[PDB]
């Protein structure tokens, strides 16, 4: 097959990211896997004249170790190729479907040759314990999993594979993102699962051996309590929370309510609700129930996700592009392992973003950098990796998105 | 010899051409020394003489070897190196003795003339051209180019290492039972064969190496145990750091104290309990290395305690892959933590130290957690797995912290061990307002140009008060106003602030701070029976917030 010429974005050089230390069991699983891939010609050992590197990890799906390459830098540095030059259009109808199934089709890439001149940029290293030896160095000979270039290049072949099935089912939406296919229909869950089975058979002829419910997706509205008697402290928390909301939702009003907070009162004192405060309150509940008037997705802009730890295995999140301009808010709940729970929430929030916008967010994670770096791999199950940074949650924000 | 191994293809940086620097004219004795050196290298094939067209050039020099009458050829590859491609890193991390398995028998081999025993990419040799100038530079010089890896060229260490690795590979496949560590131009080789069948396997290895152009010391010339390697002393069943001598001096300079701290830091790998806080404190400030620093009393106490620890020699043991690793941590005092890692109590594989602060304000629970994370990482590096921890903190204390703190946090399998001082939380804030506890509405404000400040409070019992602060930031006054309310209130108090800043700091339950204020607030929060902290939006006309906002201005 004829390779597609690939080019880095102008000026900038390839990835030079350091390999993270790996446990012995993961190093062994990677050696096994790469020894096998090498025999099959998918990768080749390289010399020191290749200065690039990207990190690799082992994840365990199933009781089978799998290789995960962290192509975040390469993807960032080749962004002209997979986004503007080629690039898969994202369907707005996908998020509308009653059911969306995610199928892994990463195996497909291993049969397409990679541009000879681009191969050096896919260099990665298997480390050794206590630096007994130099790492084992490899680069790719075929479209690698995890590179955003791979689906971009395999795009026109995927279209042929899917054409009979699309023609036969015009009301099914199929979208490719990185290594996965997203398949949405409005069918009853039995006919839906049957169609996925059929799709698998189509894929199976070309060497490609869970269910979302986007309808069930709705805002996690900032909730104002319904209370029996209100204390000064309670009214204060209310104003605080509505004060925050008014940064986001037009039409939020606070006047009638904090009229109640007059003079210097003991925090536990009971204060009766004004006919007006109660209307204002209710009128605010109306507004919080709905989407944010004035906020729209700008496809030229990165997505950001903030996560808050709420205790009792509950986590709240917001997605926006400019701060406080929420495109979406939600929650994930239910381990007494914080890192494990955070990992799950990140993957779930990422998955939603792909379906909604065909883009992955950069996460602001409420956790020590080193803690996350050591541990996230133990639980990660996806075949992509979002960008993340590490942040200390403002104690206020956590409170205002409480449930 | 020059290895018959295939060459590594090498190129210059994408926009660049090879060097073309001008040979300085040299004295006659230097010209003579170079001719003699180059002729001998030419005979072994290390270099080949050339004439133009080759346009490239790198300057050569000759230096007199020590007091001796031997000459050495120095090549200044500064330019060629700027113009040479980047290579992947040679070897990122060096072996730690604590991570070695025990070996019945071991041999140390160093490759002779390592670089000169490995061939240079044929296409690249021309860029290494240099010129021995003629006497006073009158006639055309004698021009050579390298056929082997030049000393001081950018690519040599990486290409050598990869050549040794390609060469060693076949011997590794056929000999899994045998260990070979590569470090620079050394090999360290070990088995659990008795001396006989080992000396024999070594010879196979030397011979394999010779087939490939690499010469090594014979039995007679191989170093003997113990090995002094990289600051360490390696023996058949223990290791330690090389002997450490702490100088006695009447007066210490900046440079003496830096060197002392370096030695102590090196010693802390295996000597438990070394401390350097009070010695590093001295290093604070701006001074010349020559300047004498009077030892504070605490520094002097610390040097003595260190002195006693070093008095008797200590050693570590090697790693047994079939046993778990246990890690123990102890609080040593003000921000200082020490740890030991053993598999059999209490024969340490190694020890270590942790001090770093993470911010201006922390508590002991956070710090302990950071030390656990740091030890976990080092343990994965050295042994390829995480240790089981024994921590001086009650399970209940840790779970009370984990549940209520806003950051995700987590430590692997651990157990409590009663080794005081134990780590605890020294106060907890109320989760609800306190009935019958006076409510203080506090505020602070500073004028941006003046730096004048007013901190105050109004209470629901009609108390009021404001003090004036000089040269204070708008956020220092917010802390003052809270301190003020703490020191005028009862054992139970509700405090209402509009400072997210102040709230953030207090809500994290600090037990130590770089701030005097925060440290005074803390000693107050400990005294109390109950404290509840609420936050309100500033300037919304809320409650008593307006009243105290008005008094400060
Ligand atoms: C990094 C380095 C550097 C140098 C050097 N120079 C020597 C060694 C070793 O010998 C060594 C090795 C080698 C094979 C990597 C090992 O696997 N395990 C081990 O315990 N040792 C120490 C030792 C063992 C022994 N029986 N007698 C001694 F005296 C020392 C290691
Ligand atoms: Cl769902």
- Determine whether the annotation assigns residue A234 to a binding site: no
Contacts of A50 in chain B (CB under 8 A): 88
- Whole-angstrom distance, CA of residue B533 vs CA of residue B495: 5
A360 C-alpha to ligand 2 centroid (Å): 17
Facing residues of A100 across strands? A184, A212
- Give yes or no for a contact between B126 and B12, defined as CB atoms under 8 angstroms apart: no
Does the distance separating the beta carbons of A263 and B434 come in below 8 Å? no
Among B495, B488, B502, B506, which residue's Cα sits nearest to residue B531?
A: B495
Structure tokens that stand for A2 in this block: 């004829």
- Give yes or no for a contact between B433 and A233, defined as CB atoms under 8 angstroms apart: yes
Does the distance separating the beta carbons of B544 and A263 come in below 8 Å? yes
Q: Quickly list H helices, B438-544.
A: 476-488, 500-507, 516-527
- Give yes or no for a contact between A232 and A261, defined as CB atoms under 8 angstroms apart: yes
CA-based nearest distance B153→chain A, Å = 14
Does the distance separating the beta carbons of A263 and B537 come in below 8 Å? no
A212 C-alpha to ligand 2 centroid (Å): 5
Does the distance separating the beta carbons of B500 and A51 come in below 8 Å? no
User: Is A209 an interface residue toward B (CB < 8 Å)?
Assistant: no
- Sheet hosting strand A99-104, strand order edge to edge: A173-177, A180-185, A99-104, A211-212
User: Is B381 an interface residue toward A (CB < 8 Å)?
Assistant: yes
Q: What are phi and psi of A58, to 5 degrees?
A: -110, 130
Q: Which of A268, A308, A394 faces B433 most closely, judged by CB atoms?
A: A268
Question: In what helix (H) or strand (E) does residue B163 lie, and over which residues does it extend?
Answer: helix B156-173
- Whole-angstrom distance, CA of residue A145 vs CA of residue A139: 13
Does the distance separating the beta carbons of B494 and A267 come in below 8 Å? yes
Q: Which residues line ligand 1 (CB under 6 A)?
A: B 95, 100-103, 106, 108, 179, 181, 188-190, 225-227, 229, 234-236, 318
- Sheet hosting strand B530-535, strand order edge to edge: B464-469, B453-459, B438-446, B492-497, B530-535
- Whole-angstrom distance, CA of residue A224 vs CA of residue A241: 8
- Whole-angstrom distance, CA of residue A277 vs CA of residue B168: 82
Structure tokens that stand for B154 in this block: 């950018």
Among B residues 382-411, those touching chain A with beta carbons less than 8 Å apart? 382-386, 402-404, 406-410
DSSP B95: -
B190 C-alpha to ligand 1 centroid (Å): 7
Breaks (C–N over 2.5 Å) after residues, chain A: 61, 209, 334
- Whole-angstrom distance, CA of residue B252 vs CA of residue B294: 7
DSSP B466: E
The upper half-sphere exposure of residue B462, i.e. CA atoms within 13 Å in the direction of its Cβ, equals 0
Contacts with A215 (C-beta within 8 Å, 6 or more apart), sequence order: A96, A97, A98
Among A338, A211, A270, which residue's Cα sits nearest to residue B435?
A: A270
- Give yes or no for a contact between B329 and B368, defined as CB atoms under 8 angstroms apart: yes
Q: What are phi and psi of A149, to 5 degrees?
A: -70, -25
Q: How far, rounded to the nearest angstrom, does the alpha carbon of residue A165 sit from its chain's CA centroid?
A: 28
Q: What are phi and psi of B339, to 5 degrees?
A: -145, 160
- Whole-angstrom distance, CA of residue B327 vs CA of residue B197: 38
Structure tokens that stand for B351 in this block: 């020890």
Contacts with B72 (C-beta within 8 Å, 6 or more apart), sequence order: B37, B62, B63, B65
Instruction: Please give the annotated binding residues of B, written as ranges.
Output: 110, 185-186, 443, 478, 498, 549
DSSP B87: -
| Percent of chain B as helix, strand, coil, to the nearest 5 | 30, 25, 45
CA-based nearest distance B429→chain A, Å = 14
- Give yes or no for a contact between B432 and B486, defined as CB atoms under 8 angstroms apart: no
- Whole-angstrom distance, CA of residue B467 vs CA of residue B456: 6
Burial class (CB in 10 A: 0-12, 13-18, 19+), B55: exposed
Q: What are phi and psi of B236, to 5 degrees?
A: -60, -30
Contacts of A48 in chain B (CB under 8 A): 8, 87-88, 90, 155, 158-159, 161-162
Contacts with A326 (C-beta within 8 Å, 6 or more apart), sequence order: A248, A292, A295, A318, A319, A320
Q: Which long-range contacts (CB under 8 A, 24 or more apart) does B351-356 make?
A: B351/B268, B351/B269, B351/B270, B351/B271, B351/B272, B351/B316, B352/B268, B352/B269, B352/B378, B353/B265, B353/B268, B353/B274, B353/B275, B353/B276, B354/B329, B355/B276, B355/B277
In chain B, the domains with their CATH numbers are 1-90+116-156 (3.10.10.10), 91-115+157-225 (3.30.70.270), 226-319 (3.30.70.270), 320-426 (3.30.70.270), 427-552 (3.30.420.10)
The atom number, within ligand 1, closest to the CA of B234 reads: 30
Contacts with B516 (C-beta within 8 Å, 6 or more apart), sequence order: none
The atom number, within ligand 1, closest to the CA of B101 reads: 18
- Determine whether the annotation assigns residue A13 to a binding site: no
Q: How far, rounded to the nearest angstrom, does the alpha carbon of residue A180 sit from its chain's CA centroid?
A: 13
A vs B: CB pairs below 8 A: 190
Distance set, CA A331 to CA A101, A307, B436 (Å): 21, 9, 37
- Whole-angstrom distance, CA of residue A102 vs CA of residue A120: 31
Facing residues of A326 across strands? A320
- Our separate counts of H helices and E strands in chain B read 13, 25
Question: In what helix (H) or strand (E) does residue B454 lie, and over which residues does it extend?
Answer: strand B453-459
- Whole-angstrom distance, CA of residue A122 vs CA of residue A128: 20
Query: Three-state DSSP class for B61?
Result: strand
Among B467, B417, B415, which residue's Cα sits nearest to residue B443?
A: B467
Residues, beta carbon < 5 Å, ion ligand 2: A 213
Q: Quickly list H helices, B384-428.
A: 395-404
- Whole-angstrom distance, CA of residue B535 vs CA of residue B546: 13
Contacts of B14 in chain A (CB under 8 A): none
The upper half-sphere exposure of residue B421, i.e. CA atoms within 13 Å in the direction of its Cβ, equals 14
Query: Three-state DSSP class for B391?
Result: strand
- Whole-angstrom distance, CA of residue B505 vs CA of residue B360: 9
Among A239, A220, A243, A247, which residue's Cα sits nearest to residue A402?
A: A220
Pair type for strands B438-446 and B492-497 = parallel
CA-based nearest distance B426→chain A, Å = 20
DSSP B496: E
Per-residue 3-state assignment (H helix, E strand, C coil) for chain A: CCCCCCCCCCCCCCCECCCCCCCHHHHHHHHHHHHHHHHCCCEEECCCCCCCEECEEEECCCCCCEEEECCHHHHHHCHHHHHHHCCCCCCCCHHHCCEEEEEECHHHHHHCECCCCCHHHHCEEECCHHHCCCCEEEEECECCCCCCHHHHHHHHHHHHHHHHHHHHCCCCEEEEECCEEEEEECCCHHHHHHHHHHHHHHHHCCCCCCEECHHHCCCCCCCCCCCCCCEHHHHHHHHHHHHHHCCCCCCCCCHHHHCCCCCCCCCCCECCCCHHHHHHHHHHHHHHHCCCCCCCCCCCCCCEEEEEEEECCEEEEEEECCCCCEEEEEEEECCCCHHHHHHHHHHHHHHHHHHHHCCCCEEEECECHHHHHHHHHHCCCCCCCCCEEECCCCHHHHHHCCC
User: Is A50 an interface residue toward B (CB < 8 Å)?
Assistant: yes
Q: How far, rounded to the nearest angstrom, does the alpha carbon of residue B360 sit from its chain's CA centroid?
A: 22
A35 C-alpha to ligand 1 centroid (Å): 29
Distance set, CA A382 to CA A22, A29, A59, A120, A152 (Å): 19, 18, 9, 25, 19
Among A255, A241, A212, which residue's Cα sits nearest to residue A399?
A: A241
CA-based nearest distance A257→chain B, Å = 10
Among B residues 7-36, those touching chain A with beta carbons less than 8 Å apart? 8-11
**Left if phi > 0, otherwise alpha if psi is -120 to 50, otherwise beta: which for B446?**
beta
- Whole-angstrom distance, CA of residue B206 vs CA of residue B212: 10
Per-residue 3-state assignment (H helix, E strand, C coil) for B242-280: CCCCCCCCCCEEHHHHHHHHHHHHHHCCCCCCCCCHHHH
- Give yes or no for a contact between B48 and B38, defined as CB atoms under 8 angstroms apart: no
Question: In what helix (H) or strand (E) does residue B15 lie, and over which residues does it extend?
Answer: none
- Whole-angstrom distance, CA of residue A278 vs CA of residue A282: 6
- Whole-angstrom distance, CA of residue A238 vs CA of residue A400: 9
Pair type for strands A180-185 and A173-177 = antiparallel
Residue closest via CA to ligand 1's atom 31 equals: B188
- Sheet hosting strand B336-344, strand order edge to edge: B347-354, B336-344, B326-333, B388-391, B414-416
Residue A41: CB atoms within 10 A of its CB come to: 11
- Whole-angstrom distance, CA of residue B343 vs CA of residue B350: 10
Distance set, CA B447 to CA B241, B452, B473, B544 (Å): 57, 6, 8, 22
Could you list the beta-strand ranges (E) of B346-437: 347-354, 361-362, 388-391, 414-416
- Give yes or no for a contact between B187 and B114, defined as CB atoms under 8 angstroms apart: no
Q: Which ligand has the shortest distance to the CA of A95?
A: 2
- Whole-angstrom distance, CA of residue B15 vs CA of residue B483: 64
Bond into B421 cis (ω within 30): yes
Q: Resolution of this PDB entry, in A? A: 2.3
Closest residue on chain B to A134 (Cα): B91
Burial class (CB in 10 A: 0-12, 13-18, 19+), B356: exposed
Question: What is the full DSSP assignment across B296-360?
Answer: PHHHHHHHHHHHHHHSS---B--B-TTS--EEEEEEEETTEEEEEEEEETTEEEEEEEE----SS
- Give yes or no for a contact between B279 and B260, defined as CB atoms under 8 angstroms apart: yes
Query: Three-state DSSP class for B9?
Result: coil
- Give yes or no for a contact between B521 and B429, defined as CB atoms under 8 angstroms apart: no
Q: What letters, b where the CB count within 10 A reaches 16 and e where it falls short, cover A333-345?
A: eeeeebbbbbbbb
Bond into B346 cis (ω within 30): yes
- Whole-angstrom distance, CA of residue B549 vs CA of residue B545: 6
- Whole-angstrom distance, CA of residue A74 vs CA of residue A89: 21
CA-based nearest distance A305→chain B, Å = 16
- Whole-angstrom distance, CA of residue A136 vs CA of residue A169: 47
B114 C-alpha to ligand 1 centroid (Å): 21
Burial class (CB in 10 A: 0-12, 13-18, 19+), B461: exposed
Among A residues 128-147, those touching chain B with beta carbons less than 8 Å apart? 129-134, 137
Q: What letters, b where the CB count within 10 A reaches 16 and e where it falls short, cover A284-322?
A: beebbeeebeebeeeeeeebbbbbbbbeeebbbbbbbbe
Pair type for strands B130-132 and A388-390 = unpaired
- Give yes or no for a contact between A143 and A154, defined as CB atoms under 8 angstroms apart: yes
DSSP B147: S
Q: Which ligand has the shortest distance to the CA of B349?
A: 1
Ligand 1 pocket mutation pick from B227, B239, B319, B383 by most atoms within 8 angstroms of CB = B227
- Give yes or no for a contact between B434 and A268, defined as CB atoms under 8 angstroms apart: yes
């Amino acid at each position: 097959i004829e390779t597609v010429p690939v080019k880095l974005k102008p000026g900038m050089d390839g990835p030079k990211v350091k390999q993270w230390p790996l446990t012995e069991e993961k190093i062994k699983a990677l050696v096994e896997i790469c020894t096998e891939m090498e025999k099959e010609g998918k990768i080749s050992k390289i010399g020191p004249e290749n200065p690039y590197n990207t990190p690799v990890f082992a994840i365990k799906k199933s009781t089978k170790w799998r290789k995960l390459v962290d192509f975040r830098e390469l993807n960032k540095r080749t962004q002209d190729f997979w986004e503007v030059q080629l690039g898969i259009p994202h369907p707005a109808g996908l998020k509308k479907k009653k059911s969306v199934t995610v199928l892994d089709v990463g195996d497909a890439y291993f049969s397409v040759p990679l541009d000879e001149d681009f191969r050096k940029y896919t260099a990665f290293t298997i480390p050794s314990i206590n630096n007994e030896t130099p790492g084992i160095r490899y680069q790719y000979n075929v479209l690698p999993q995890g590179w955003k270039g791979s689906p971009a290049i395999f795009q026109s072949s995927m279209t042929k594979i899917l054409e009979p099935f699309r023609k036969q089912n015009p009301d099914i939406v199929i979208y490719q993102y990185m290594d996965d296919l997203y398949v949405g229909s409005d069918l009853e869950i039995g006919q839906h699962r049957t169609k996925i089975e059929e799709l698998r058979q189509h894929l199976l002829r070309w060497g490609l051996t869970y269910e979302l419910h986007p309808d069930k997706w709705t805002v996690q509205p900032i909730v104002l309590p319904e209370k029996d008697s209100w204390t000064v402290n309670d009214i204060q928390k209310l104003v605080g929370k509505l004060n925050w909301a008014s940064q986001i939702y037009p039409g939020i009003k606070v006047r009638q309510l904090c009229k109640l907070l007059r003079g210097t009162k003991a925090l536990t004192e009971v204060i009766p609700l004004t006919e007006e405060a109660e209307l204002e309150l209710a009128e605010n509940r109306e507004i919080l129930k709905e989407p944010v008037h004035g906020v729209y997705y700008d496809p030229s802009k990165d997505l950001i996700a903030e996560i808050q730890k709420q205790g009792q295995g509950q986590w709240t999140y917001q997605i926006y592009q400019e701060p406080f301009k929420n495109l979406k808010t939600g929650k994930y709940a239910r381990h007494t392992n914080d890192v494990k729970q955070l990992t799950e929430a990140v993957q779930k929030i990422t998955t939603e973003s792909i379906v909604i916008w065909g883009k992955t967010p950069k996460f602001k994670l409420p956790i020590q950098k080193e803690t996350w770096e050591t541990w996230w791999t133990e639980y990660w199950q996806a075949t992509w990796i979002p960008e993340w940074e590490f942040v200390n949650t403002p104690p206020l924000v956590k409170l205002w998105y409480q449930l």
